[PDB]
Design a protein around this ligand. Structure first.
Ligand SMILES: NC(=O)C1=CN([C@@H]2O[C@H](COP(=O)(O)OP(=O)(O)OC[C@H]3O[C@@H](n4cnc5c(N)ncnc54)[C@H](OP(=O)(O)O)[C@@H]3O)[C@@H](O)[C@H]2O)C=CC1
Ligand code: SF4
Ligand code: SF4
Ligand SMILES: [Zn+2]
Lengths: 45, 118, 147, 177, 355, 388, 123, 144, 137
């Protein structure tokens, strides 16, 4: 395993670690436009 | 007007202040809150206040229906709400309305109407 | 571009060598690039009034891997390193008194990290009962709209 | 013969709309008017609260807009002062100091909030290090809008505050109470 | 996140047919739906009450007479939560305005002394009747009177006589009325208890300091009123919020003197003389003890055992001897340090006089 | 053993031009240690800028100093032009110059005349603030606002000068030398001013460099550094002026430097008023600067560009830069980073008052409290800057 | 030179757990010796033993952390807080952030089972 | 130095009496907000929501929908003047010159909820100050 | 100028009634031609004397004893302020805005019942359902 727990030094709450979910993704190619620049980046929300 | 509160009581308000504006009673858009629903939800903050002195501007939807239609020879009317009195633009972007169709047609910015001479 | 071990030596060269008398310390700054393994990137800016030139010097760090302090050479780095610690969490080894300078005395978090929300986690109000400014969880009356 | 009735009047007008008609009423009105004359002609704020946006407040101490002509004097110390001017950003590292200075002031005391950053946090409303309004700490009587409010806005706000204290009831309320 | 510690659910429904949906986590921005009315929030107990109500977004209507005593309430909540009206018991429309849109009403009215415009009767009986008739007309779902401890319809004290008549009139017009009967309350900036024993140059008792009572922290009574405003089980009920420990006046004074490290001054001069000196002090414009209160110095607390208590609300009321330190440390003089000996040798190492 | 006595100068201090908790430790009168605490006014600018476009963020940089706005935004404009790789038109350069010097006057007035008032001389303050209030009419004429303005924007200037402004500037300029001289009469040759400013705050060249000090604090040690000459930016290369320098590094030399900068700035204002070239005041690339309205209301591409600049904003190339200026306080600077978006990725404001206050401990050791007041007055820290 | 303040320790990252053990123990000892000062300087409404209890709790929080660098970070942060507290930099609010428990019971319903959370929409 | 002080004793003071004599004001000045109308009586706002986007402080809050006559118009337009910094980017973005900033600065209040201006409070403010807005626009538009 | 000859000559120019009025309102004595009066009744003057420095040429004489600058009608609030040289009374016709609606000037009513109350022009975005029941035929 041996992945450091920076959550202890982050100074942030623990509720983010214990109750909250994230999603990692690429923004879908919009159908209203034909561009693709907003993609290629992996957002986290 | 007597408006029934949610808590079973009543809310008396005179007729001049229930109109949505001094020139129109009804609402001019589906999401608009009528003055009765406003009062009924907010009388705690209207109670000891004078309603004569609150802002009650006129509505434009009724003042623009009064404006006479304009006419043109051709399938186009150009609009630019320009003052013509002072310098600069002072109006709205140029817009060419098609007026071939039988009825009147209004600019999308200002509501001035145009017709094909008939 | 250098590594944290190379900071004191290269700074000695850039301060003492004749052709590179970079005696003034203009700034220290950290930057967060979470995509990297070493997310932080400490940046020294330097100046030479002698030759009329500036130069930069970049290292890298982590939330736990410290950086050597150049207070041994440039005394003005004291406050700038205290800032970079308080803002990003970087630890400047050898620093005589490293402590927060901007943020509130009991603040828990490092603001300019990209994981830290804009508004923070806390807010203060006056409690008439306790008669004390008390810290409570955040609740905004108009939420942040990013655009 | 213990009391067991009450001639308590209805329709007694409220203080805002209570006109005088008795000699005691004119007397208490005169005493209140003199006390309020005093409170108006001598309007001494405390030097605290002027952190950010102190330039526009100093311009009201300047020649073109003299505040001293109205009897305004800024004082180092709360204990001699009556008014507090929360200019500038009210940060979370500073709010307790503000409440200390406000509790140290001797009553009567007012508060006037100069600028947007002190009324609702203004520009830094969404920041981690800000109180989103000085209302959250202290009670505010007048809110000057602006960022930075013009010297004229500050003078007008003081002229609204003088009006508040001038339509105040010190003894007439006791004659009601 | 914050919590709605006062509410058990988020969808509540009053007995007047209003639905009240909660919004938020329970902070400054949240709303409880409720709309209340507190007739003495300017005072000692009502201040703590509005603070507890408006901390969670409950709209609070606060009738006032002095504009300047109240301003310390606007702090207690977000914009639009605390709402103020100028009111007087001699004007009826003002009272209908204050109670119209309310789901809850709270009467904290009552002076510990008489005046020129208000005797004990007019303020504890007629004022209660006026408010009750308006609470009835508008059919407000809840009414929460507060009538003083030891209240009894006929008694040596006119205060307790009126307070008892205010009870029966409220409950004989508003049958669903809740009545609370707090015992002598104490806390920070109290009226006649700790600020007096800590500030007054000399105490006096027409009895000995022998009047027995059960005192209570005011924050807990405010917690009680909060836990009654929202619990609809408490209609047509009565409460005795007295406190675990029985304390004679002399016991309280000795604890006050111990904690203060200063010798409180008590005199114990007889009844008629003190009663006369109080009567003559009622002509100066500021509140002072009044002839009817030295009468209550001989009336210890009779507790009604038929009425509900703190333990019917899941509360654990606090003890005076613990809290007296927090409440009297400001007047603690703290003269100097103890036993300076065994410090000469340490002080001898430091430089005391520079040149 | 010297045991110390800790005192707070006070977060509620009338003298300071802002809020500062200064924790001093005294052995009688002499200061031996100093721990300037700050953050009582830190608003959190450097984080918020990361969520705002390059245009929406310009107002941030005007609130970083109660005075000296038009220079403080002149640094962001230069950074973002250096990234965008555009060139400002000549008239915009001369205007940015002229208003930069009007701003340096407006700062040196407040600074010198707050040093005075903290040292006790109430009068030069109120003799100078009127001059400031005549010079702020020029501000309200060009921008609309009296202090925080936003005139200078990336790509030049927001709107052109209104007619009949250079004339009024020339009038004020012909009359300003007299009022500066009236201030010099009270302060310069006086005994008490020298007693309070001669051999105080004395700092050496090598220390002033090691501590990051710039501006008059450095030019009082004997080093002729002025970014306006060693790295001209707007038009300081196309207009004559001289840089004063002083020995002894005291407060008196810094006061003399500041008065010299008043007069040299007056020389510059006269020159720029005598030669303001015609042309545009903003870049003619409507992909960076919003167009005129008589086009936005008549041409399509101009309305599109207006829409995008005032919704999404303009895309700066990826890169990074520290660019700096000779702000009246010292060497102000901005470290911007770009990622190809309309929003910055990082923006660190280097604030000269920061390093000044940081040196305050080295500078005050050995001096009595009145001298500490005079020291903070030499630096005339604006604590909104110090707290960033 | 810009000299260090009163109780400042130079940041020094130990290479071993056995030395940091000692440094942490000295920090704990200093907190305990200084707790009465933390009660005098901040106008506190409870016991010195309760302060020492909270200190023991805060040190038990990170008792089971075996990564050395994180321990060095924790120790440095704790020395920062000791310097903040013993020098009278913190005011009462920032200190009683560590003592929520001592303040009066916040209301009645503090959900601990599912159904109450559901009735309050917290599940 | 004392004599240089005395000569000022005999010179004209700079002071003006504010409520009876106001200080200089320019067409470019930025004070209170206002929503304008056309000479027809119709309002100029079309809910382009550019003022809502460029505003640094995010004070503005808008919500539109199709009006009964088939046009684009607002049902909500708010400004929190406690969030406003008075930058004038909102009078710059509007392509119809609806929202403006008046030279008015005399609009202090006793409450913070009188400063959460809504659409009706702005439309009346524009009906009131229209003559002043026309002066400022006739002498500011060419440069804007 | 702050000289006594100024106030004396001014009090000779404008009569003693106006002198006591000016002393009770402004605190100074000032004399100048009338330019006109607004809709609230406030009169606006202008001076030409050399003694009067910049920003003291134009002045006001309010009608109400409880004067406030909010009582000044628009146009004058801009002329009073040196925004223009021509008053609304003499400004030409084409420069006057056209109004399809009546004018109605209302000052800052703060501190009084007529203070502006804010409200939501919208209704709740999520409209709920009004119950109606059916039977199981
Ligand atoms: N505190 C205690 O120890 C005990 C209190 N009680 C009862 O509990 C309540 C607590 O009041 P307390 O906390 O003592 O602080 P106060 O008694 O000062 O609260 C008095 C309130 O009643 C209002 N009030 C009094 N007389 C009138 C009137 N004639 N017309 C209108 N409003 C009036 C006052 O308004 P303003 O302040 O604006 O004048 C004030 O807000 C009282 O009903 C008291 O009888 C019972 C037993 C003990
Ligand atoms: S000018 Fe005022 S309302 Fe307009 S965007 Fe700027 S801060 Fe917002
Ligand atoms: S920019 Fe103008 S038209 Fe567009 S929403 Fe704003 S006020 Fe309305
Ligand atoms: Zn059109």
């Amino acid at each position: 395993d041996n992945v450091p727990a920076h959550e202890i030094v982050s100074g942030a709450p623990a509720e983010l670690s214990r109750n909250r979910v994230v999603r990692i993704y690429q923004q879908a190619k919009p159908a209203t436009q034909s561009g693709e620049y907003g993609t290629f980046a992996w957002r986290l929300d | 007007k007597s408006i029934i509160s949610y808590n079973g009581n009543t809310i008396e308000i005179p007729e001049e202040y229930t109109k949505q504006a001094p020139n129109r009673d009804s609402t001019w858009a589906p999401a608009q809150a009528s003055k009765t629903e406003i009062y009924k939800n907010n009388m705690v903050r209207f109670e000891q206040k004078d309603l004569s002195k609150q802002p009650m501007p006129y509505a434009g939807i009724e003042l623009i229906a009064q404006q006479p239609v304009r006419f043109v020879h051709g399938n186009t009317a150009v609009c630019d709400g320009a003052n013509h009195n002072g310098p600069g633009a002072q109006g709205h972007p140029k817009i060419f309305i098609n007026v071939d169709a039988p009825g009147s047609h209004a600019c999308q910015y200002c509501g001035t109407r145009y017709e094909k001479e008939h | 571009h250098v590594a944290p071990s190379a900071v004191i030596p290269v700074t000695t060269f850039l301060r003492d060598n004749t052709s590179t008398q970079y005696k003034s310390i203009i700034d220290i700054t950290a930057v967060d690039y979470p995509s990297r393994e070493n997310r932080f990137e400490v940046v020294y800016n330097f100046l030479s009034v002698r030759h009329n030139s500036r130069i930069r010097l970049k290292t890298y760090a982590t939330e736990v891997t410290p950086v050597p302090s150049i207070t041994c050479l440039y005394e003005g780095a004291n406050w700038f390193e205290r800032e970079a610690y308080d803002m990003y969490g970087v630890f400047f080894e050898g620093h005589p008194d490293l402590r927060r300078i901007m943020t509130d005395y009991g603040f828990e978090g490092h603001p300019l990290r990209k994981d830290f929300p804009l508004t923070g986690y806390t807010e203060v109000r006056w409690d008439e009962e306790k008669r004390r400014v008390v810290y409570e969880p955040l609740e905004l009356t108009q939420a942040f709209r990013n655009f | 013969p213990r009391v067991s009735s009450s001639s308590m009047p209805t329709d007694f007008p409220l203080p805002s709309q209570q006109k005088p008609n008795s000699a005691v009423d004119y007397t208490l009105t005169t005493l209140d008017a003199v006390a309020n004359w005093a409170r108006q002609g001598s309007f001494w704020p405390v030097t605290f609260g002027l952190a950010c946006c102190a330039v526009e407040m100093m311009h009201v101490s300047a020649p073109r807009y003299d505040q001293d002509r109205l009897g305004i004097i800024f004082r180092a110390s709360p204990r001699q002062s009556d008014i507090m001017i929360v200019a500038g950003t009210l940060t979370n590292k500073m709010a307790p100091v503000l409440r200390q200075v406000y509790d140290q002031m001797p009553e009567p005391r007012w508060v006037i909030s100069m600028g947007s950053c002190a009324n609702g946090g203004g520009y830094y409303h969404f920041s981690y290090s800000v109180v989103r309004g000085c209302d959250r700490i202290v009670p505010v009587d007048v809110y000057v809008p602006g960022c930075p409010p013009t010297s004229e806005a500050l003078m007008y706000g003081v002229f609204q505050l003088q009006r508040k204290m001038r339509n105040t009831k010190i003894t007439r309320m006791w004659y009601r109470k | 996140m914050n919590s709605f510690e006062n509410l058990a659910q988020d969808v509540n429904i009053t007995r007047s047919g209003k639905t009240l949906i909660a919004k938020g986590t329970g902070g400054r921005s949240s709303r409880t739906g409720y709309t209340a009315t507190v007739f003495g929030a300017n005072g000692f107990l009502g201040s703590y009450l509005t603070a507890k109500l408006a901390k969670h977004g409950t709209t609070v209507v606060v009738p006032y007479r002095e504009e300047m005593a109240k301003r310390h309430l606007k702090v207690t909540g977000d914009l639009g939560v605390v709402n103020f009206l100028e009111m007087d018991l001699r004007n009826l429309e003002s009272i209908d305005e204050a109670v119209r849109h309310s789901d809850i009403v709270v009467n904290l009215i009552g002076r510990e002394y008489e005046t020129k415009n208000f005797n004990y009767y007019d303020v504890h009986v007629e004022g209660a009747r006026r408010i009750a008739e308006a609470v009835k007309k508008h059919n407000i779902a809840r009414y929460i009177h507060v009538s003083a401890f030891n209240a009894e319809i006929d008694s040596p004290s006119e205060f307790n006589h009126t307070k008892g008549l205010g009870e029966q009139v409220t409950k004989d017009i508003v049958p669903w009325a809740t009545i609370v009967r707090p015992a002598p309350m104490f806390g920070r900036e109290d009226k006649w208890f700790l600020d007096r024993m800590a500030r007054s140059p000399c105490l006096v008792s027409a009895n000995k300091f022998q009047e027995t009572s059960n005192p209570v922290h005011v924050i807990d009574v405010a917690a009680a009123l909060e836990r009654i405003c929202f619990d609809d089980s408490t209609v047509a009920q009565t409460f005795e919020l007295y406190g675990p420990q029985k304390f004679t006046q002399k016991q309280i004074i000795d604890m006050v003197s111990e904690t203060l490290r200063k010798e409180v001054r008590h005199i114990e001069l007889p009844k008629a003389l003190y009663q006369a000196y109080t009567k003559a002090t009622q002509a100066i414009w500021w509140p002072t003890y009044s002839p009817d209160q030295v009468e209550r110095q001989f009336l210890s607390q009779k507790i009604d055992p038929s009425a509900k208590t703190f333990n019917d609300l899941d509360l654990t009321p606090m003890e005076l001897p613990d809290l007296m330190f927090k409440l009297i440390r400001p007047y603690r003089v703290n003269t100097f340090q103890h036993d300076v000996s065994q410090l000469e040798n340490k002080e001898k190492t430091f430089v005391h006089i520079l040149d | 053993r010297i045991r110390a006595f800790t005192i707070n100068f006070g977060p509620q201090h009338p003298a300071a031009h802002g809020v500062l908790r200064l924790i001093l430790e005294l052995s009688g009168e002499e200061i031996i240690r100093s721990d300037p605490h700050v953050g009582l006014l830190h608003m959190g600018t450097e984080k918020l800028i990361e969520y705002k476009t390059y245009m929406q963020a310009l107002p941030y940089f005007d609130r970083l100093d109660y005075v000296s706005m038009m220079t403080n935004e002149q640094v962001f404009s230069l950074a973002v032009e250096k990234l965008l790789n555009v060139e400002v038109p000549l008239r915009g350069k001369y205007i940015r110059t002229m208003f930069g010097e009007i701003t340096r006057v407006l700062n040196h007035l407040m600074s010198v005349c707050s040093h005075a008032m903290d040292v006790g001389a109430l009068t030069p303050f109120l003799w100078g603030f009127e001059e400031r209030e005549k010079l702020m009419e020029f501000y309200e004429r060009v921008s609309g606002a009296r202090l925080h303005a936003a005139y200078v924007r990336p790509g030049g200037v927001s709107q052109d000068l209104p007619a009949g402004l250079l004339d009024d500037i020339y009038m004020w300029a012909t009359q300003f030398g007299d009022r500066l001289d009236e201030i010099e009469e009270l302060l310069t040759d006086n005994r008490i001013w020298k007693l309070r400013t001669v051999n105080i705050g004395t700092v050496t060249a090598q220390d002033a460099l090691n501590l990051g000090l710039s501006g008059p604090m450095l030019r009082g040690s004997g080093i002729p550094f002025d970014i306006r000459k060693n790295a001209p930016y707007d038009a300081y290369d196309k207009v004559d002026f001289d840089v004063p320098v002083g020995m002894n590094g005291d407060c008196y030399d810094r006061y003399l430097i500041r008065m010299a900068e008043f007069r040299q700035s007056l020389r510059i204002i006269e020159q720029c008023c005598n030669d303001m070239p015609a042309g545009a005041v903003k870049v003619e690339d409507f992909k960076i600067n919003s167009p005129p309205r008589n086009l936005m209301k008549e041409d399509m591409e101009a309305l599109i560009h207006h829409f995008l600049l005032y919704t999404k904003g303009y895309s700066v190339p990826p890169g990074e830069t520290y660019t700096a200026i000779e702000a009246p306080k010292g060497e102000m600077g901005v470290y911007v980073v770009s990622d190809g978006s309309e929003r910055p990725y990082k923006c660190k404001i280097r604030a000269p008052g920061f390093a000044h206050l940081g040196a305050f401990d080295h500078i005050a050791r050995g001096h009595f409290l009145p001298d500490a007041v005079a020291i903070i007055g030499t630096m005339d820290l604006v604590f909104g800057e110090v707290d960033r | 030179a810009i000299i260090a303040t009163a109780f400042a320790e130079t940041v020094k990252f130990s290479g071993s757990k056995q030395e940091l053990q000692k440094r942490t123990l000295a920090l704990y000892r200093q907190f305990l010796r200084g707790a009465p000062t933390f009660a005098d300087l901040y106008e506190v409404q409870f016991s010195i033993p309760t302060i020492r209890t909270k200190i023991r709790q805060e040190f038990e929080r990170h008792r089971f952390v075996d990564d050395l660098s994180i321990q060095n970070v924790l120790y440095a942060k704790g020395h920062m807080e000791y310097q903040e507290c013993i020098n009278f930099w913190k005011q009462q609010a920032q200190f009683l952030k560590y003592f929520p428990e001592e303040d009066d019971i916040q209301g009645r319903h503090q959900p601990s089972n599912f159904v109450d959370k559901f009735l309050k929409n917290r599940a | 130095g004392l004599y240089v002080v005395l000569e000022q004793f005999f010179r004209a003071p700079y002071t003006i009496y504010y409520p009876f004599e106001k200080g200089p004001v320019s067409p470019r000045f930025r004070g209170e907000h206002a929503l304008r109308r056309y000479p027809s009586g119709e309002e100029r706002c079309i809910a382009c929501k550019l003022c809502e986007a460029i505003c640094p402080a995010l004070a503005i809050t808008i919500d539109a929908e199709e009006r009964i006559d088939g046009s684009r118009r607002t049902t909500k337009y708010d400004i929190d003047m406690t969030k406003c910094i008075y930058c004038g980017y909102c009078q710059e973005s509007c392509p119809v010159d609806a929202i403006v900033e008046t030279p008015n600065v005399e609009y202090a209040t006793e409450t913070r909820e009188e400063l959460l201006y809504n659409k009706e409070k702005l439309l009346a403010n524009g009906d009131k100050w229209e003559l002043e807005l026309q002066y400022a626009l006739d002498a500011d538009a060419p440069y804007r | 100028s702050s000289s006594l000859y100024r106030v004396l000559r001014n009090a000779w120019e404008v009569g003693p009634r106006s002198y006591w009025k000016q002393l009770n309102s402004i605190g100074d004595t000032k004399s100048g031609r009338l330019v006109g009066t607004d809709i609230y009744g406030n009169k606006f003057y202008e001076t030409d004397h050399q003694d009067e420095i910049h920003l003291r040429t134009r002045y006001v004489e309010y009608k109400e004893k409880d004067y406030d600058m909010s009582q000044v009608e628009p146009g004058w609030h801009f002329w009073l302020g040196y925004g223009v040289d021509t008053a609304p009374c003499n400004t030409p016709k084409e420069k006057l805005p056209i109004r399809a609606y009546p004018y109605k000037f209302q000052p800052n009513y703060t501190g009084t019942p007529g203070a502006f109350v804010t409200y939501n022009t919208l209704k709740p975005k999520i409209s709920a359902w009004e119950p109606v029941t059916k039977q199981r035929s």
